[PDB]
Design a protein around this ligand. Structure first.
Ligand code: CLA
Ligand code: CLA
Ligand code: CLA
Ligand code: CLA
Ligand code: CLA
Ligand code: CLA
Ligand code: CLA
Ligand code: CLA
Ligand SMILES: CC1=C(/C=C/C(C)=C/C=C/C(C)=C/C=C/C=C(C)/C=C/C=C(C)/C=C/C2=C(C)CCCC2(C)C)C(C)(C)CCC1
Ligand SMILES: CC1=C(C/C=C(\C)CCC[C@H](C)CCC[C@H](C)CCCC(C)C)C(=O)c2ccccc2C1=O
Ligand code: SF4
Ligand code: SF4
Ligand code: SF4
Lengths: 51, 670, 184, 79, 125, 86, 119
């Protein structure tokens, strides 16, 4: 848990504005998703994340 | 003869079975007494008594059905708004069912007419009465009187035949006589009698109502005396079913009368043909199937199949006047007969098993392994195929890949044979509508219809697998080699051989009831969603159609989430938000009660009787402490009884849940 | 210092007097006849039933039955006025503090039910004691059964007189204690 | 991101994402070295637990065993 | 109990003439024949109605997936031959199960070949 | 294989022997009851475990007790038909 | 960029959720056919016999399985039991303590742990 918060997460940004922000559990790497468009779990071209 | 009809056995409960003669030592005795009540085969005395009991009980049940018909007729004559429904059926909901003003139950009666408040009936009896030319209250009075007289006659006949029939009685075994007289005199000579009834009382009456004279000059024209109208007054050429009656939105009753006349002629001619026709192949079946349980199973299967044909033919082959627009009536008439088809099919399987255990089976039981094995394979194949197309669509829609799912706008599985099945109906290239309501439009079958039909096939095949496995493996098996000596219904043979629970044919029925229920719950949901989405609904004057579900089926029923959201959640808003709403309060309450009963069944389904026996003993300790000794010793339910109670509560609760869910929604929408 | 905000909405009495031990002194509750939610709820009941009534004919029997229902609703409104309801729901409350002298108290129904339930149990126990046979449980001796049923009225005294005189309970060494848990 | 649920949309709750990397590849490799050490030690422990204690070691194994001086005291202090 | 579909003349001669049963075939020949059949057939379900069914290639993906299926079933056959060790294909005086292992290896080779041949036919034609 | 044990409370019913579907039980002479006979289980390797013997035993608590041993099952104690373990 | 950790994912996720599970399943089905398979729960394995004998070879655990282990001086116990039975022996009873105990120890249960005959 500590690693995934360190690497695949946004603790450095959530700590600044915790009330409206949302933490990240870890990235999503699943080849079954759409290789096109953008999943509802990612900010367009950015990687996929879980709260 | 009748001097032996004595009440001395009324006080002596359990007299009919010699296993209950020891007295009620335990509470298991009560349940056994109730279980063996109608099991005439195992009861005391000779085989002649079995025949007497069977025939007289048939007559008594027939009297019971006649009493039920009489009650419906009296409700229609004296507790109904059938008058205003006759005058204006498109604005008045049928109601022959009131509720007393007690405990606020007054909230159940709802506005059906300006002078009537009551519970909207969905039995379709009003449409039947109108199709039966019943206009005045006197006609319903005399129908009720005749049904009561029939009840008394059948009750007296059941009473008499327990002593008219004797040890020498043999008329029930004369199967040639039974088949011939039944076929000819009933299917032929009574079908033409009903054709006569229609030609002489419906066509004189129903055209008069459709001609706009609901007055019918009171009795001056309605009371027959209309031999200037001609039998085929408004056939309008065409073909029967191609052109519906524009006023009542049904097939013209002249065509129905012609149908009954021709069917009676056909049945009479078949009875004449049976003097010399194809035989000597069903002859092994002829000799080996002369027994109560086998003929009972055959008749149950036949009647259930006829029930499902009735369910599918009562909805979009409209026969009854003003019935196609009455959507709750159509829904009820389909679904009730669907459920009865399922239940009577299950009963046919059970009595096939009973016949196998009592009588001697036939040749097909010797290669039972290939039969019940290819059945297993086909069940697995169509389960891993039909359902999973739903799982595949669901997963790929959740993943955001709608172009990879099985839909019309995607990889599409065309219903090739159904799309080429324009043979049925073969109507003209448009729809029919009576009054803001769609009478019938052809169901355009696509991918979702293909998948749900395969789901139906899979569920039917699994239920049949359970039934045929119970039937074929009744006498013996590779697991237990003396299942015949264990009887028809038994909990198990013991925890040995790894475990032998639920090997009896009774337990096979126990599982088959669950699987039949699951089979036609999907049938009920498919019908209930498809009709709302694609057939029923309002209209627009510009030929545009606004259905009730707004075409949700072809776009949502491809995924399980679609069924959960657009059927069990969005269409359950009517039943769930039904408190304090006059008509639909009981439906919301019954929805809640059905959930409670269904969950309550799980206590019997999941638990064994030993835990309950030990708990009962712990409680009996406290009872004995205070000198409260029940000498009918408290015993927990037997294993078979526990399973039976669980199955009954499960099916009853689930059926009640669906019942409320569909009926409340259709009453609100209409 | 405003206990309402300190405790997240709930308010505390803050006073230690015996006069506040009654339920009627609670600040959560309020007499129904001066509660806004009670008025609104029963007015909505009257409005809904009246709106249903207008849908029917004036001279019909349904109209008369709806008039009777309206009278029942208004009688219910005036009868529950002295009953306590919460200051936010308007639904009258049932008092389960043993008050014995408030509207909607649970002491009177408790007493009535306990008497009649003890009556039922005592009648059944008397019948079982006087019919020490299984044949008498399936074929009830109706005269004896109704005799015990009528005799059960004196259960609160007869039962206690049996308890103290050693005629109700039985020593544990005379009934089956339960399964063995040891032997070796 | 396409939010779901009423509260996220009606409050504007957002999930910030760092534009940097988080941990460099060197740090991940440093963690993976010790993860591999844990993995090897855990496989060894699984082997030892699977095989269990060998009492017959006193016939073949060298040495003569040892009971620590506190373990003797704990033996004779009671139980 | 003899039935037409298993004990008839045609059924018996068809089962006996299968690659698994045909007389006079070296184990590698049976493996090669079965593998060619499997590899040629397995390409179709992937190159069509697959995840990349509409891509310009849409067939090399199917080729890779079919070769993967052939390899997986060959690994399963190797597990079977190293655990059950059928000895009906071993010649006399050989390591038990050697014939079955040879058959499975040549099934893998034949699956590769059949998959490649189906892909070549699809691309060329 | 299961474990079928016969206790002293046996009264020589022979019902347990008659109810056994695989001839596990037999009657042996004895002197601890008026019937001068007690049951015995010389062939429990053929005991499937159906417990019909326990159903048939009329003593207050069964003079014959079958102890199920599932981690012990043999081909005879499982009633294997399609498959041979020998 | 916020990515660039997916270079690790594209190797690890396929590896540990496909290659490792498949290798583990194949190794498990291979292990299922060893004579040592599940030797701690499955009766009649060779390693179980060797472990039991190894325990019995330890000087402390030689007479560990005997339910009667513990009697420091069994001769004294037997003599006291015989003396106590002599004063209570019924009339001209011919049963001694020694043969009574010998026949009370010898029962007839051939089908007990008969699975100690294959491995
Ligand atoms: C065909 C169906 C399918 C399959 C095979 C997978 C496979 C996978 N998904 Mg996945 N997923 C699917 C459908 C599917 N998904 C759908 C329909 C959704 C909803 C849109 C998701 C949403 C989803 C999320 C949100 C995540 C995954 C993740 C994963 C990976 C986790 C593997 C793992 O750690 O195993 C471990 C397995 C177990 C512990 C189960 C033991 C039993 C794996 C590659 C995770 C990932 O990317 O990991 C890196 C992740 O965070 N999936
Ligand atoms: C067998 C079918 C059947 C069924 C299900 C019902 C059911 C019902 N009838 Mg009914 N009825 C029947 C046959 C039937 N009847 C027949 C054959 C007749 C003619 C003799 C009647 C004549 C009749 C009248 C005259 C009335 C009912 C009423 C009722 C309702 C309340 C009954 C009541 O108060 O309990 C009575 C319970 C007992 C007497 C216990 C025994 C109930 C829905 C009443 C109703 O709907 O009120 C608005 C009412 O007034 N029925
Ligand atoms: C399905 C209905 C059914 C059937 C098949 C029969 C069949 C029969 N009845 Mg019967 N009966 C019935 C209903 C039925 N009954 C009812 C409802 C009543 C009450 C009115 C009677 C009252 C009745 C009497 C009083 C007698 C028969 C008799 C008979 C036998 C000869 C009658 C005949 O030729 O026909 C025959 C076995 C006669 C008989 O047993 O002949 C010796 C006879 O005496 N029945
Ligand atoms: C089987 C049931 C049945 C019954 C009980 C009746 C009863 C009746 N029909 Mg009728 N009808 C029926 C079926 C039936 N119908 C069917 C299926 C059709 C076909 C559409 C008709 C068509 C029909 C017409 C067109 C007429 C009737 C009429 C009548 C009435 C007087 C005629 C009569 O009784 O015939 C008496 C018996 C005969 C005429 C048959 C005699 C034939 C002889 C014996 C044979 C020798 C012929 C010779 C060799 C040449 C009577 C109420 C008439 C009416 O309106 O009266 C009120 C009338 O005009 N019916
Ligand atoms: C020749 C006269 C005649 C007439 C006018 C009818 C008329 C009718 N039959 Mg019919 N029928 C007839 C002879 C006739 N039948 C014969 C001789 C048989 C025996 C094979 C049948 C067997 C039969 C069955 C089994 C069914 C009908 C049905 C129907 C109805 C649907 C019509 C339709 O959609 O057809 C389209 C062309 C209609 C009222 C159906 C029905 O009752 O619908 C509810 C139905 O299921 N009929
Ligand atoms: C024409 C129809 C018909 C007939 C004549 C029979 C006749 C018979 N069946 Mg049978 N059966 C039928 C249909 C039929 N069945 C169907 C459709 C099924 C499938 C469910 C079965 C399943 C079945 C089984 C599994 C068994 C029988 C048995 C029997 C025999 C004894 C029945 C008995 O004593 O029960 C006495 C009657 C009862 C116990 C009725 C109790 C009420 C039921 C169980 C619950 C119904 C709940 C109700 C609908 C909802 C309540 C309303 C709620 C709001 C409160 C007898 C030969 C038994 C036997 O031994 O055969 C030889 C047996 O084991 N049948
Ligand atoms: C995860 C999928 C997978 C698996 C388990 C295997 C498994 C195997 N492959 Mg293989 N293979 C695969 C995908 C896979 N292959 C793909 C996608 C390709 C295309 C590049 C190949 C190309 C390939 C070749 C060219 C060869 C194998 C060989 C082998 C075997 C060693 C073994 C059975 C070898 C073989 O069959 O030798 C016996 C061999 O020569 N494979
Ligand atoms: C009959 C033998 C044969 C022939 C004529 C071809 C012919 C071709 N292959 Mg091919 N191939 C074969 C066997 C064959 N292959 C086998 C056995 C394998 C498995 C290793 C492959 C794997 C393979 C790949 C992976 C690719 C080709 C490609 C090609 C094309 C360049 C050409 C049409 C290439 C191509 O054009 O793909 C679209 C390509 O990418 N082949
Ligand atoms: C539908 C149908 C059917 C069936 C059919 C089938 C079953 C088919 C199959 C088919 C198939 C299944 C085919 C296949 C083929 C294959 C092939 C033709 C292959 C080839 C291959 C090759 C040629 C290869 C080569 C190679 C190798 C070997 C290695 C190296 C490389 C190479 C490439 C050189 C039936 C009769 C039932 C009926 C109806 C019709
Ligand atoms: C609860 C339970 C019992 C105990 C339940 C018993 C003994 C039911 C009998 C209790 C009385 C006699 C039922 C009478 C009806 C109820 C008292 C009231 C029902 C109607 C109310 C709504 C008024 C079993 O014996 C049993 C046996 C096998 C499998 C599962 C179970 C099981 O789940
Ligand atoms: S659990 Fe119940 S059904 Fe199963 S073997 Fe035991 S007693 Fe029979
Ligand atoms: S049934 Fe019981 S009491 Fe009778 S002989 Fe067998 S073991 Fe003895
Ligand atoms: S459990 Fe069954 S097989 Fe075993 S001894 Fe008892 S009756 Fe015989």
């Amino acid at each position: 848990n500590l690693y995934h918060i360190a690497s695949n997460a946004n603790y450095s940004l959530w700590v600044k504005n915790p009330i409206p922000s949302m933490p990240i559990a870890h990235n999503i790497w699943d080849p079954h998703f759409t290789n096109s468009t953008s999943t509802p779990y990612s900010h367009t071209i950015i990687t996929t994340i879980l709260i | 003869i009748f001097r032996y009809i004595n009440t001395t056995l009324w006080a002596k409960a359990g007299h009919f079975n010699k296993a209950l003669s020891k007295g009620a030592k335990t509470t298991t005795w009560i349940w056994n007494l109730h279980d063996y009540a109608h099991d005439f085969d195992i009861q005391q005395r000779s085989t002649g008594l079995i025949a007497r009991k069977v025939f007289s009980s048939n007559l008594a049940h027939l009297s019971l059905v006649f009493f039920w018909i009489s009650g419906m007729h009296l409700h229609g004559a004296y507790l109904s708004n059938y008058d205003i429904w006759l005058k204006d059926p498109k604005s008045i909901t049928p109601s022959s069912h009131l509720a007393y003003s007690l405990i606020g139950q007054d909230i159940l009666n709802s506005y059906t007419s300006e002078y009537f408040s009551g519970i909207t009936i969905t039995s379709g009896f009003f449409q039947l009465y109108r199709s039966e030319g019943i206009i005045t209250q006197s006609q319903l009075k005399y129908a009720c009187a005749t049904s009561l007289i029939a009840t008394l006659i059948c009750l007296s006949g059941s009473y008499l035949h327990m002593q008219l029939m004797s040890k020498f009685t043999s008329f029930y075994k004369k199967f040639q006589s039974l088949s011939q007289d039944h076929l000819i005199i009933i299917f032929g000579s009574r079908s033409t009698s009903l054709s006569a009834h229609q030609i002489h009382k419906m066509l004189p009456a129903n055209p008069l109502l459709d001609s706009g004279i609901s007055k019918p000059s009171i009795l001056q024209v309605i009371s027959n005396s209309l031999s200037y109208t001609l039998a085929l007054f408004s056939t309008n050429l065409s073909s029967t079913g191609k052109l519906l009656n524009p006023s009542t939105r049904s097939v013209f009753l002249s065509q129905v009368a012609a149908h009954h006349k021709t069917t009676g002629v056909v049945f009479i001619t078949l009875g004449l043909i049976r003097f010399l026709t194809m035989y000597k192949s069903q002859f092994s079946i002829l000799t080996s199937y002369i027994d109560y349980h086998i003929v009972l199973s055959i008749n149950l299967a036949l009647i259930a199949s006829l029930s499902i044909i009735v369910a599918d033919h009562l909805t979009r082959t409209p026969i009854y006047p003003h019935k196609s627009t009455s959507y709750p009536t159509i829904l009820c008439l389909s679904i009730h007969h669907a459920w009865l088809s399922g239940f009577l099919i299950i009963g046919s399987g059970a009595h096939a098993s009973i016949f196998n255990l009592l009588g001697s089976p036939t040749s097909e039981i010797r290669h039972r392994d290939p039969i019940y094995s290819h059945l297993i394979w086909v069940c697995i194949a169509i389960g891993l195929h039909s359902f999973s197309l739903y799982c595949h669509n669901d997963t790929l829609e959740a993943l955001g890949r709608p172009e990879d799912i099985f839909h019309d706008n995607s990889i599409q599985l065309k219903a090739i044979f159904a799309k080429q099945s324009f043979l049925r109906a073969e109507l003209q290239p448009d729809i029919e509508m009576l009054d803001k309501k769609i009478i019938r439009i052809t169901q355009e079958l696509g991918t979702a219809d293909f998948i749900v039909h395969h789901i139906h096939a899979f569920t039917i095949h699994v239920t049949l697998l359970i039934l045929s496995k119970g039937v074929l493996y009744a006498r013996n098996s590779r697991f237990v080699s003396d299942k015949l000596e264990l009887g028809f219904t038994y909990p198990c043979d013991g925890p040995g051989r790894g475990g032998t629970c639920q090997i009896s044919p009774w337990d096979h029925l126990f599982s088959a009831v669950f699987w039949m229920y699951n089979c036609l719950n999907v049938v009920t949901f498919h019908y209930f969603w498809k009709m709302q989405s694609d057939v029923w609904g309002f209209v627009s004057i510009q030929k545009h159609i606004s259905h009730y579900s707004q075409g949700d089926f072809s776009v949502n029923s491809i995924t399980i989430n679609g069924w959960l959201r657009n059927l069990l959640w969005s269409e359950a808003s009517q039943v769930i938000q039904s408190y304090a709403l006059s008509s639909i309060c009981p439906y919301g309450f019954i929805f809640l009660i059905g959930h409670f009963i269904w969950a309550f069944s799980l206590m019997f389904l999941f638990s064994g009787r030993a835990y309950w026996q030990e708990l009962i003993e712990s409680i009996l300790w406290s009872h004995h402490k205070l000198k409260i000794i029940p000498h009918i010793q408290p015993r927990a339910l037997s294993i078979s009884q526990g399973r039976a109670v669980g199955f009954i509560h499960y099916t009853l609760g689930g059926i009640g849940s669906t019942w409320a869910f569909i009926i409340s929604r259709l009453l609100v929408l209409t | 210092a405003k206990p309402l905000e300190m405790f997240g909405g709930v308010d505390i009495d803050l006073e230690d007097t015996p006069a506040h031990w009654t339920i009627k002194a609670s600040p959560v509750l309020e007499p129904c006849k001066d509660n806004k939610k009670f008025h609104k709820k029963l007015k909505d009941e009257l409005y809904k039933v009246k709106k249903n009534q207008q849908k029917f004919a004036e001279g019909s029997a349904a109209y008369a039955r709806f008039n009777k229902k309206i009278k029942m609703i208004e009688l219910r409104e005036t009868a529950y006025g002295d009953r306590l309801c919460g200051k936010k729901d308007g639904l009258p409350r049932t008092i389960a503090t043993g008050e014995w002298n408030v509207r909607g108290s649970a002491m009177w129904p408790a007493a009535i039910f306990l008497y009649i339930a003890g009556w039922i149990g005592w009648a059944g126990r008397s019948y079982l004691i006087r019919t020490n046979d299984a044949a008498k449980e399936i074929n009830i001796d109706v005269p004896l059964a109704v005799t015990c049923m009528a005799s059960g009225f004196s259960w609160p005294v007869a039962a206690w007189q049996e308890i103290v005189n050693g005629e109700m309970a039985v020593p544990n060494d005379q009934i089956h204690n339960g399964g063995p848990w040891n032997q070796s | 991101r396409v939010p779901g649920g009423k509260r996220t949309q009606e409050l504007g709750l957002v999930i910030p994402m760092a534009d940097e990397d988080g941990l460099t590849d060197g740090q991940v490799a440093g963690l993976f070295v010790i993860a591999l050490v844990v993995f090897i030690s855990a496989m060894d422990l699984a082997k030892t637990m699977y095989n269990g204690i060998n009492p017959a070691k006193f016939k073949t194994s060298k040495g003569k065993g040892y009971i620590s001086p506190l373990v003797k005291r704990y033996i004779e202090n009671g139980f | 109990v003899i039935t037409l579909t298993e004990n008839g003349l045609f059924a018996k001669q068809f089962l006996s003439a299968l690659a698994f049963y045909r007389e006079g075939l070296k184990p590698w020949q049976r493996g090669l024949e079965i593998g060619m059949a499997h590899g040629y057939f397995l390409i179709g379900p992937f190159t069509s109605l697959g995840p990349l069914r509409n891509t310009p290639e849409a067939a090399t993906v199917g080729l890779l997936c079919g070769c993967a299926i052939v390899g997986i079933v060959s690994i399963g056959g190797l597990i079977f031959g190293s655990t059950i060790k059928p000895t009906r294909f071993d010649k006399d005086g050989d390591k038990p199960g050697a014939g079955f292992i040879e058959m499975i290896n040549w099934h893998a080779v034949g699956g590769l070949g059949g998959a490649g041949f189906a892909h070549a036919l699809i691309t060329v034609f | 294989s299961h474990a079928v044990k016969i206790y002293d409370t046996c009264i020589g019913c022979t019902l347990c022997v008659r109810a056994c579907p695989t001839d596990v039980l037999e009657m042996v002479p004895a002197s601890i009851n008026a019937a001068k006979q007690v049951a015995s289980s010389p062939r429990v390797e053929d005991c499937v475990g159906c417990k019909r013997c326990e159903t048939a035993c009329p003593t207050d608590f069964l003079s014959i007790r079958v102890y199920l041993q599932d981690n012990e099952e043999t081909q005879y104690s499982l009633g294997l038909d399609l498959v041979d373990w020998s | 960029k916020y990515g660039d950790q997916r270079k690790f994912a594209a190797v690890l996720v396929p590896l540990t959720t496909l290659v490792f599970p498949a290798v583990a399943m194949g190794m498990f089905v291979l292990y299922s056919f060893q004579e040592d398979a599940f030797w701690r729960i499955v009766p009649g394995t060779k390693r179980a016999r060797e472990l039991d004998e190894a325990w019995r070879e330890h000087p402390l655990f030689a007479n560990s399985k005997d339910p009667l282990d513990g009697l420091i001086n069994p001769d004294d116990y037997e003599k006291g039991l015989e003396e106590a039975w002599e004063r209570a022996k019924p009339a001209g009873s011919t049963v001694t303590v020694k043969d009574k105990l010998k026949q009370l120890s010898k029962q007839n249960n051939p089908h007990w742990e008969s699975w100690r005959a294959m491995s």
